[PDB]
Amino acid sequence: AAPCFCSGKPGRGDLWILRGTCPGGYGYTSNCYKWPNICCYPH
């Protein structure tokens, strides 16, 4: 997914869209949000 970096975490984040939420069960738990979209961690 996107090499989008996040706040507090260098490296990358998966770029998700204006979902304000990530699929809880695909593997995420930790995520950063920047409306109107989101990039999801761990990564």
> What is d(CA 24, CA 7) in angstroms, rounded to the nearest whole number?
21
Tokens matching residue 37:
């979209």
Measure Cα distances from 32 to 36, 40 in Å.
12, 6
Domains of the chain (ranges; CATH) run 1-43 (2.20.20.10)
> What is d(CA 25, CA 4) in angstroms, rounded to the nearest whole number?
21
Q: Got the DSSP string for 1-39?
A: ---EEETTEEEEEEEE-TTSS--TTTT---EEEETTEEE
